[PDB]
Design a protein around this ligand. Sequence first.
Ligand code: 3WF
Ligand code: 3WF
Ligand code: 3WG
Ligand code: 3WG
Lengths: 279, 279
Amino acid sequence: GLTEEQRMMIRELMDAQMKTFDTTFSHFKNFRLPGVSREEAAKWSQVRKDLCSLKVSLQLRGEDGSVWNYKPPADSGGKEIFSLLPHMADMSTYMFKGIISFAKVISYFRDLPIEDQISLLKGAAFELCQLRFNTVFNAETGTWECGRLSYCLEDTAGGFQQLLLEPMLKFHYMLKKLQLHEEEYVLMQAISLFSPDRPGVLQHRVVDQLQEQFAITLKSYIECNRPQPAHRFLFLKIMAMLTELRSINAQHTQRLLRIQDIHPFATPLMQELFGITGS
Amino acid sequence: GLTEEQRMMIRELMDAQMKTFDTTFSHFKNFRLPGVSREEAAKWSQVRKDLCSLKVSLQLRGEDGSVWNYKPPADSGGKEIFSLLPHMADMSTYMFKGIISFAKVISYFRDLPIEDQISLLKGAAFELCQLRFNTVFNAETGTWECGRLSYCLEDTAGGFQQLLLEPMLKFHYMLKKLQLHEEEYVLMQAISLFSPDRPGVLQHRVVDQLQEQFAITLKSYIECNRPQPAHRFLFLKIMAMLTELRSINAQHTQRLLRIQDIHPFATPLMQELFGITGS
Ligand SMILES: C#C[C@]1(O)CC[C@H]2[C@@H]3CCc4cc(O)ccc4[C@H]3CC[C@@]21C
Ligand SMILES: C#C[C@]1(O)CC[C@H]2[C@@H]3CCc4cc(O)ccc4[C@H]3CC[C@@]21C
Ligand SMILES: ClC1=C(Cl)[C@]2(Cl)[C@@H]3[C@@H](Cl)[C@H](Cl)[C@@H](Cl)[C@@H]3[C@@]1(Cl)C2(Cl)Cl
Ligand SMILES: ClC1=C(Cl)[C@]2(Cl)[C@@H]3[C@@H](Cl)[C@H](Cl)[C@@H](Cl)[C@@H]3[C@@]1(Cl)C2(Cl)Cl
């Protein structure tokens, strides 16, 4: 069974999720939409490869029942590969705010020194974003269902299996297949958030002990509520997914910074979280 | 055969069409797009009936290869029925300018007094718009193909036959089925433009004689270039379509003014041409 402290812990995390996760994306508005040198040469080639590796179309369902649909352009060696970047920057920025709010509502987080709060959020914001995004992911239709917005994966030559070579996409399908509870998602967010080895963390003995407690609570939760053979080793699978998410976080940070280098687009909040300084 | 004067006449009309018809709609830009009392009660009911009687979705093909698609809302008793009005006002305004330019390039038109020019354009602008729109109408797919913009008729319960109850739509299908030449379309535009019985025309003996000459030139053109049994009575069918277009013009003017009464949207050029004064 769960100890009282373990029940309190889950309770406070679920409370924080409830207050700060706009699951219908109702308050996401005023966002942008797509319009209607050998060293440099190597930079663009890489960014081009990075960008086309994850193509989505976009749908907007109006409250009135109207539907707008956007199919992205092909790469034709020009700036059209950047068409969805302002929009995506706005969406991630919106998600990041929710995630910052999530963190601030948690007592264990508030109690850390401010410099560590910042270091942990800089370290985990993206990961907590992916974790929240997975809960609105539809693995049957390859679509992230964000209230009135949908982001639908473009077909490719190898269909599912091939698009699934992309680590971000493999991560989303694999996590969704685990069929996690809300409680388990939010404990994943805590474990990722309270990671002792993020750049700049000072109170890392504290953070490490906090992390260990969230992990023990998760292991205990699974043991108390999931007896089926399907869920044998579920706790270890989740921890393995969390390690993988940190790898993905590192890869995508590098992509971001590679795009940013040749085509600036990061919002001010994005710059803050990813260490772009404005100069 | 055609007399020299008849060849000159067609030549000058075709010249005017060539210079003033943006057939790829390349210069149509900066247009608006849909966003992302018992006496009054009777007004809205009528306007609602008027508006839903011709529903189109809209597609925009970007030069980069991107595609935007808009599916209109259902009537739910609110202002959503007006969603495409600003856009359509911008498109018609764009077409009207081309049509005004067309008229001004024609010697027979320039030679009329200015007050008659204005009276003829007020009378015929809409009709010449429909005539030009028919040349980019695709009767197989029920779409008006305006370069990178397409306007596609929405499906309904009776399919083609039922949507074809709408006089505007019946007119477009019937005219397209006649498979007219460019020359014949532009002579239709001249006959409509030079109509002696538009409100306010003063030199109507002149205009009537001008109109009669364009009609004789058209009859002669058909007789010289169309011997097939399919085209027997083609000249009379065209004149019957022109009479029908004037009926449509009267109906649609009333719809326009009915919408305008309860929901103003007409551009300044629209107001000028339809006699809305600004007060
Ligand atoms: C390059 C590249 C990509 O693989 C396709 C689009 C890129 C994202 C664009 C938006 C965005 C926003 C962030 O806050 C952080 C990263 C990104 C980019 C990550 C790499 C992506 C998915
Ligand atoms: C009401 C109604 C309708 O049948 C559907 C949309 C209406 C048009 C909107 C744009 C427009 C522009 C013009 O310059 C003149 C008329 C109109 C309206 C005509 C009636 C329409 C087709
Ligand atoms: Cl997830 C995910 C979503 Cl969602 C989109 Cl729209 C975008 C957000 Cl804005 C950032 Cl946070 C992340 Cl890296 C990406 C991806 Cl992989 C896509 Cl391109 Cl699908
Ligand atoms: Cl034709 C024709 C076209 Cl085109 C559209 Cl988009 C619109 C123009 Cl802007 C005005 Cl001029 C005319 Cl009345 C209408 C219709 Cl019937 C539709 Cl709603 Cl299809």
